[model samples]
Target: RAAVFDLDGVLALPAVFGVLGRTEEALALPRGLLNDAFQKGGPEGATTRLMKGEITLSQWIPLMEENCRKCSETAKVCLPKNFSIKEIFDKAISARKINRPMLQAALMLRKKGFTTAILTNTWLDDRAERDGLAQLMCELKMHFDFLIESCQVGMVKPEPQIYKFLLDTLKASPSEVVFLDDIGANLKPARDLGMVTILVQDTDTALKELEKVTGIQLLNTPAPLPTSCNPSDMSHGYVTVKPRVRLHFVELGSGPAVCLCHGFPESWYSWRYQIPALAQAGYRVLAMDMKGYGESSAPPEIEEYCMEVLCKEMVTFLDKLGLSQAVFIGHDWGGMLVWYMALFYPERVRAVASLNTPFIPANPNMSPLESIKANPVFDYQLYFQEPGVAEAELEQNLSRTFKSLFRASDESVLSMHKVCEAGGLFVNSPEEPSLSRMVTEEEIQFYVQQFKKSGFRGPLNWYRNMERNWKWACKSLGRKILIPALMVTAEKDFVLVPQMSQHMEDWIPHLKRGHIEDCGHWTQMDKPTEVNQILIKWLDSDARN
Candidate 1:
């Protein structure tokens, strides 16, 4: 469903309440006096009229002042000369905590494919940043696709006109969208117009109900990390280069270098177990949050995330770290990136290894997503590669989204893929049920939080560059990977099966294969000891040899 939301009560803890609280106390009025003034057909009946665009709030503000003057003596209270929405927002926003989970869900809803707008009744004409809820909104600009403030368009809640305006603006019919508000008056007209309305009661209660109403999981409980993965072993830092791209990475141990590149929707922590094990195995192991993921700079444009740029970034990272050559190991999308590195900058990568994904010599026919789309079982790529489609869907219930993919086996991919078969990704089980115990809640939450900050579009950009990747594949000087290569396949890996690497021996002269059984797509994390052992054995011998 197209997700429509209210701002103050929903996203932030009734910051506007503080506005009324302060206004009443300051003006020496009854608890409900200020509220009554704005009620339809009250002293200042122009509240609705102003929202209907029949009159400006500027003109109505004075009527409000005049009514306050008239009623002051009768109500046994005094009134301020001037009061405005801007001042109310300023007073109320001070005592607020952003409904963090709701904000996360809203962003996830967008990433998942549900179109959204902040259909809030805020009347401040100022930009949402710098002051008030508007500034807070600026900070969370990506949470919704559009911002619909009552003042900007001269409309407020409880009026069908504003609802109709939002529907027309979003190009969505009322049936296609769900509207949420704290007030029943707002809900009635919206519901009357064919929108399913959720009454937001208070902070905690309404959201889980929101999860239930939308069937998209908003709440999550993460499992803890294992004892083997010590938090202290790795150190984190950033390296910023020209053009303002900063790469965030974590490292441990000391020896011939090993650069670990994580896949999409993952961070450097994706290599946690391997990081400590590889360091103990006598190699300087480092893992990086890829561009648009974790701590790395996520450039906004699709073309910026192209494989060629990533390849160059890999080289830049090596140079900054003062390493001429390092063994490159990647998983999933990271697996794909290292291959491109081997193709373009063969000198920088001493050896290469991958988990799940195979070095696909690009197809001459069509883009990879198009090919995946052609294959019905592999139609998940159709969901991911679409621009901004999976961002919200994959993110909405971060735990569930991660659960759908981080399985003990790839049994969950099709089920996960089917949910995103259409456009809306955030439109998942609001319950956000877990998939398998293979990944802990902590790990999934870790992935979720990083994604919350950096977003999914940056990594998804790699898929966007498919046609160009094809061009690079064909234009490269050679058809085969001349470097020493090893591939560890997950037998039950849904997205990229072990069988996908079947042709590796033909292409890579110095190739080794470890087809691990009973592992899911998340090979390193799913079956850590096995993956670590596989990597240590190869890297140790190869480093010596």
Candidate 2:
């Protein structure tokens, strides 16, 4: 089979819009005003004619300037003296960044023996060179088998000739080729030619469709780890919640029940610092490895890890323990789950405290997957959604995974910032990040050993179910927590900022906020004393009620 991809707006989006948006901001015009001007259509619209090679760069510059001036005048906003369409366009072209995921998708297709080609509609003028597209064309030369540009080929898309040329050059019939483009119009003629057409909206969604069309996993998805691991002494507690689903936990000193849940890529070991502290402070502490991590039943089905199912298992665990209710505490993914517990099974959660996650009521406007994909920072989640990719990357070196995750927190360096940049997590991170003072070499070794037995497939399945969780969350719309809640924020957590918790009172009127200054995302680990003191003081008062 053959795969033909579009360049701009498909593999990578043009940066021109952002450049124009910034110019509009400087000119006191509303953002997206200039973009509207281009799309508004004049004697010659900004991009359409230029993209078809009907207008030169010099000619396009004056048209853009006129359009901007007219746009601002109509909007009653004055253009700043510094406004220059030429400078803005130049800056935009120079601002290109590789769309890493799409690039990888192309490479994967090629590796699977598909004839990969690039059929892009671009200008013929020197503007293409100045627009930084020439550099991208050079990179395409290395990966793609055929490069068809409208400017060079004398044909633009939505025209039958270009589609025929693409088909003829590939030496493949229309039925054998799969075409992908961002615009629906571009896909129409190709679809008419009998080639499979895929419209690219979101890269993740497009990739999923492509996977179905090709009948190839494309991502080389790793198999989910089995529910059982090698036989070892039962040093920890294990209780079966359902068929083939057993949870592993560590129990400490007896008192009022306190259940601790850990987040992604973590075992019960993540709560090591808090376990003893809470237990010694006169509370029974039980920290468990949630499904897909260490010593827990790792159901191979992605459906098994949905938030509602996981929450149900927590309740079932409590049921097995003969406790009607317990104070629930979590951090990171665990924090997210515990908050979910309070919302999904409030009666089983006597009180809820989250280290970094805040109580966010479901928004009818967007699903969790949509919300997560819209933000550039959560690119890691998108990376995880592709099966076997992240698992292979993380499981490649268990030491690298744990060390990178448990390293000393730095306010300046956001660890996940490179998830997209370097193509995967820990791929770009330093080989030996300085270990945080809270963890020792022994602890890191323990984590490495645990993950070696479990692998990353199960932990990753949690992310795969965000859409299911969003649906689950929608059921709780307009719901509020009547029970006492605590939101503990880490000041230096770039992802889960303290400001995110500011509106907790809207849904959780009985919410208590605690700020740990100078702490990072690993709040309890980075500042154990402060976290312990805060938890003890709150739990002490909460116990009175």
Question: Per-residue CA lDDT of candidate 1, range 396-503, in tens?
Answer: 667776776666774453354554545454344445565567766776777787778767778778777877777777776356788878888888876687777888
lDDT of 2 by residue, 1-545 (tens): 99999987667665344566676676667878888767558324665676667876767778777877887788887677777777777767666555656767777788789999989877655654463566556555557889898767767778898899999999999889999888788899999999999998787788889998998775546432111111241137889999899999988756889888888888887776667667656788888898888889898789899889999999999999899999899888888898889888888999999998887877777778778766676888888988889989889888767777765446223357547667877664666666656566777788899999879989999889887888888899768887878999998887888888899998888898799988977776677778888888888888536
Q: Per-prediction count of colliding residue pairs?
A: 24, 2
Off by over 4 Å in 2: 1-235, 411-415
Q: Cα deviation of 478 in candidate 2 (Å)?
A: 1.9
Local distance difference test values of all predictions, in order: 0.73, 0.78
> Which pairs clash (backbone N, Cα, C closer than 3 Å) in model 2?
222-388, 263-334
- Give the CA lDDT, 0 to 100, for residue 542 in model 2: 80
All candidates: CA RMSD (Å): 18.7, 23.4
- The residue-level lDDT of candidate 1 at 156 comes to 74
